[PDB]
Structure formats: C-alpha cells, structure tokens
RNA sequence: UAGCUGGUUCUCCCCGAAAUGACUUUAGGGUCAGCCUCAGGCGCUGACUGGGGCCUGUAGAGCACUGAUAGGGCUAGGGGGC
C-alpha cells in the first residue's frame, strides 16, 4: 500500500461547477438570465415580500 | 449605491420551461403558487378513452316574467266640433 491509489473513495469527487464556459453554464451564470441577478437580492427568506 | 445597461471564456450526453394568479410606493423589481429538472419514496393511480350516474343555463329558441315594438281591434283619459 503506497501513495499510488490510496485515492479518494470513488465518490468524494470534489467538482465545483464553472459558469464561464461556452457549453454548460454560459452567457449568463449558473442560472441568471435576466436582472436583479447581480450583487444580491433582498433577503429573500424572512424578508422580501 | 445602481431593482439599470454591458460583458461572463473547454467538450460530449439526458431532460427541459415561462412570459400566468395572488399580494406588492408594485408595475421592465420581487414573495408564494403554476410550469422545468435531480435524488429517495409509493406502484397502475396518469393524460386520453368506454359505460354509468349526478351538476349546468350558452348556441339555438321563446314572450310565460322584465322591458322594448309596428299594424289593427275593443277600450279609460285627453284635445276639437254641435
Ligand atoms: Mg444590488
Ligand atoms: Mg428531450
Ligand atoms: Mg406601464
Ligand atoms: Mg424596477
Ligand atoms: Mg381518477
Ligand atoms: Mg305575446
Ligand atoms: Mg289606430
Ligand atoms: Mg283604434
Ligand atoms: Mg277646430
């Protein structure tokens, strides 16, 4: 048993998503689409009705 | 600060919307619902269809009600002549 393959347990796969792409998540971000998708939105739990 | 405008970069595979309601100093913004997607459940219930009951007041029609209406009749009221 050596440093080759004590590797992660076929499922802790660290893999964040990247939203600059061209195929995946693209012009807009992961989501987005629109406006008030920018720096924040009021709360939105407790707050904004 | 910017509920505004602009920009957001590799690939292939599956699914795939919405532009509606409610409230909103809300109306090109939002919150919950609606529609999309993923995971774990349940398992013939699903759209569509057959048969069966119930429920309805449109199209049409009708004048019995509410009103409207032309012609005539009979007929109170009025106006005119002896
Ligand atoms: Mg902001
Ligand atoms: Mg498809
Ligand atoms: Mg307006
Ligand atoms: Mg606005
Ligand atoms: Mg059923
Ligand atoms: Mg009649
Ligand atoms: Mg007459
Ligand atoms: Mg007459
Ligand atoms: Mg006279």
* Torsion, CA A6, CA A7, CA A11, CA A15, rounded to 10: 160
Q: What's phi and psi for A43, nearest 5 deg?
A: -130, -50
Rounded distance between C-alpha atoms, residue A25 and residue A31, angstroms: 7
d(CA A29, ligand 9 centre) in Å: 98
Query: Which residues, other chains included, contact A28 with Cβ-Cβ below 8 Å and sequence gap of 6+?
Result: A34, A37
Question: Is A46's CB less than 7 Å from nucleic acid strand B?
Answer: no
Chain B bases under 7 Å from protein CB?
1-6, 8-13, 23-24, 28-32
Nucleotide nearest to A44 (CA to C1'): B31
Nearest CA-CA partner of A30 in A40, A45, A20: A20
Compute the radius of gyration of chain A from its Cα atoms: 19
Data resolution in angstroms = 3.4
Rounded distance between C-alpha atoms, residue A19 and residue A15, angstroms: 13
Rounded distance between C-alpha atoms, residue A45 and residue A31, angstroms: 19
d(CA A45, ligand 6 centre) in Å: 68
């Amino acid at each position: 048993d050596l440093r080759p393959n004590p590797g992660a347990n076929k499922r802790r796969k660290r893999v964040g998503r990247g939203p600059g792409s061209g195929h995946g998540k693209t012009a807009t971000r992961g989501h987005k689409g629109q406006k008030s998708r920018s720096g924040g939105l009021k709360d939105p739990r407790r707050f904004e009705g």
